[PDB]
Write a protein that binds this ligand. Structure first.
Ligand SMILES: CC(C)(C)NC(=O)[C@@H]1CN(Cc2cccnc2)CCN1C[C@@H](O)C[C@@H](Cc1ccccc1)C(=O)N[C@H]1c2ccccc2C[C@H]1O
Ligand SMILES: [Cl-]
Ligand SMILES: [Cl-]
Lengths: 99, 99
């Protein structure tokens, strides 16, 4: 689709067998989701936002469906104020910024 | 342009007669720039992201060019970790997300 920016660009995602709403975020290097369970090994990571850093769990090779489009990549899980789809997964669904 | 997301979507902006680098950020509601002088009066604002909130100065109706596209709108100034062009100005320059 073509998504305008009048409002936050929120879409439905399927991750870990769950449906969530998430923000398509070209400013985010990484994908960060609120607390949930994910399969496999993880390792801790610190990620920095406009108000400083938070600690998250990094899970690799996680399959996600983003507004109907499948991808695989790293997903960070922690106390984020918003579910965020970052560039690591936006590239995979073919998302571009156009003007 | 059509900007892919394999790297950060950084562009040159011009504000106050000076060129700066800034991030085109669909996850940002507002536009925030590192400390600089702007004309007129300012209003208080708090903006929240990962990590928490920061206090910024809100300046309205500021002339800014974004990748050569002219805009006039609200620019926040404060201790942001990065110059960010948010949706208030991305809409002015006609930007969309497409996949
Ligand atoms: C991976 C992670 C998510 C941690 N990245 C970021 O937070 C990066 C940080 N960098 C910088 C960085 C920081 C540290 C280290 N390297 C890089 C600058 C750009 N942000 C991306 C932003 O788009 C993130 C959003 C998240 C959010 C959306 C809605 C509600 C809460 C949080 C963000 O912070 N947006 C906020 C925002 C942003 C600007 C102006 C106003 C507002 C309000 C709000 O929309
Ligand atoms: Cl990845
Ligand atoms: Cl591509």
């Amino acid at each position: 689709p073509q998504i305008t920016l009048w409002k936050r660009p929120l879409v439905t995602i399927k991750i870990g067998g769950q449906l969530k709403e998430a923000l398509l975020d070209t400013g985010a290097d990484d994908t960060v989701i609120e607390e949930m369970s994910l399969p496999g090994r993880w390792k801790p990571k610190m990620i920095g936002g406009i108000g400083g850093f938070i600690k998250v769990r990094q899970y690799d090779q996680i399959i996600i469906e983003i507004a109907g489009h499948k991808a695989i990549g790293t997903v960070l899980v922690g106390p984020t104020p918003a579910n965020i789809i970052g560039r690591n997964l936006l590239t995979q669904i073919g998302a571009t910024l156009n003007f």
